[PDB]
Amino acid sequence: GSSGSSGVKPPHGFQKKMKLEVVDKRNPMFIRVATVADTDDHRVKVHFDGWNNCYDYWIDADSPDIHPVGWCSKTGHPLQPPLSPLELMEASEHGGCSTPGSGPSSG
Numbered sequence: 334g335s336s337g338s339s340g341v342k343p344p345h346g347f348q349k350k351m352k353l354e355v356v357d358k359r360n361p362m363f364i365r366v367a368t369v370a371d372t373d374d375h376r377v378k379v380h381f382d383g384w385n386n387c388y389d390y391w392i393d394a395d396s397p398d399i400h401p402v403g404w405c406s407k408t409g410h411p412l413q414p415p416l417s418p419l420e421l422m423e424a425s426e427h428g429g430c431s432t433p434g435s436g437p438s439s440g
Contacts, residue, residue: 345394347377355379356398383416
């Protein structure tokens with residue numbers, strides 16, 4: 334492709350498959366990383382890396398709570414890391430025996 338030209342303007346100013354610091358609705362004093370899954374007319378589905386998709390919610394891209402990647406420095410507020418690299422591992426069925434990890438020693 335890449336044959337021609339196509340210029341347009343953004344609806345709010347956000348993109349998909351990107352990162353952004355979102356303020357936990359339930360906790361306005363806590364912020365974590367997010368991932369723009371889908372950008373609506375005037376909204377954007379912010380998905381918290383790890384946190385069960387269910388958590389995901391449609392937040393206004395123009396919302397004052399929404400902050401760009403690096404808003405922790407601007408204001409100087411501490412950022413909290415997302416879920417563990419094992420908490421997002423779903424549909425993991427392990428069908429096999431295991432060995433006991435216990436057995437002290439004394440005499």
